[PDB]
Design a protein around this ligand. Structure first.
Ligand SMILES: Fc1ccc(-c2nc3cc(F)ccn3c2-c2ccncc2)cc1
Ligand SMILES: [Cl-]
Length: 306
């Protein structure tokens, strides 16, 4: 049968989660579209049952989609959530692999707020990348707002009732994407709130410069490539990465790298630091983003851009 979760018809396949069986769906009750997620049963890495419970925990938070169904169906686990638009990596490629200063700033402030809400619910993300940040759908009220999805790497960091941080430890397996992970993750240290914020700092320079200096290194094995990548991050100060860029981006990365392990980041102060970039350059924060000027003003297309 084509109907799963009682009320959800399976449509076309959308991927972008390894080859995880993701689809576009349609609630046969009201017609709203969804994003159906399958997971093979009796697999070596079961994580769908817990990703559901993370969406219910963050249910009601802005930028986090709602979870609507989870149950057994044949030899698969199915999770129905909201359907969202392209990723920041998708819009990045379509704008020439370079974002202007105003759009990097405006997106940065929304990404900081989404990460803070995750931290207020006793969770850290541990997989910061623009591929997991999506806008909304065309014609919707949240069409160009930034959303956060995929919490298969999210990790509890403090007790929900005592608010006591997890103890510091080392000698852990490398977890995340090598291009954006913090220096502390390269060293096999326990991740905390400060590492999500440093990963966000690497994404900002990735948008401004179009590339990062630790891209395209040669190494015979995989382990030696992550070492060589983390080495370039300790040799490059924040000032050189900020060459020809507003120095507040260098101040941000340096500050989040000086945070203690169990310290609480000054989120509002970081967002005010990134806002003053627009004041120094005579710009307003009205919400105008670069991808809003694609294709003569129509916006992003299907067959021309994808
Ligand atoms: F239940 C789920 C859980 C995760 C997804 C998902 N994963 C990725 C990975 C990606 F690189 C890009 C996009 N997405 C989605 C996604 C796509 C469209 N609209 C909502 C979410 C979907 C459904
Ligand atoms: Cl790379």
């Amino acid at each position: 049968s084509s109907v799963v979760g009682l009320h959800y018809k399976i449509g076309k396949k959308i991927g972008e989660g390894s080859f995880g069986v993701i689809f576009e769906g349609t609630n046969i009750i009201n017609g709203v579209p969804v994003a159906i997620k399958f997971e093979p049963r009796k697999t070596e890495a079961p994580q769908l049952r817990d990703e559901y419970r993370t969406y219910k925990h963050l249910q009601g938070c802005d930028g986090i989609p709602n979870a609507y169904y989870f149950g057994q169906e044949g030899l698969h686990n199915i999770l129905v959530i909201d359907l969202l638009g392209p990723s920041l990596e998708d819009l990045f490629d379509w704008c020439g692999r370079r974002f202007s200063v105003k759009t990097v700033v405006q997106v940065a402030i929304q990404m900081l707020t989404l990460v803070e809400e995750v931290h207020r619910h006793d969770l850290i993300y541990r997989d910061i990348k623009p591929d997991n940040f999506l806008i909304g759908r065309r014609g919707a009220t949240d069409e160009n707002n930034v959303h956060l999805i995929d919490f298969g790497m999210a990790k509890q960091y403090r007790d929900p009732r005592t608010k006591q941080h997890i103890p510091y430890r080392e000698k852990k397996s490398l977890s995340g994407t090598a291009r954006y992970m913090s220096i502390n993750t390269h060293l096999g240290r326990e991740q905390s709130r400060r590492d999500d914020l440093e990963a966000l700092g690497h994404v900002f320079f990735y948008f401004l410069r179009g590339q990062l200096p630790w891209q395209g290194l040669k190494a015979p094995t995989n382990k030696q490539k992550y070492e060589k990548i983390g080495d370039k991050k300790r040799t490059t100060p924040a000032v050189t990465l900020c060459d020809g860029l507003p120095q507040q981006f260098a101040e941000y990365l340096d500050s989040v790298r000086s945070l203690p392990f169990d310290a609480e980041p000054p989120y509002e102060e970081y967002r005010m630091l990134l806002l003053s970039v627009l004041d120094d350059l005579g710009q307003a924060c009205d919400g105008d983003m670069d991808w809003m000027h694609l294709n003569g003003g129509r916006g992003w297309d299907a067959t021309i851009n994808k």
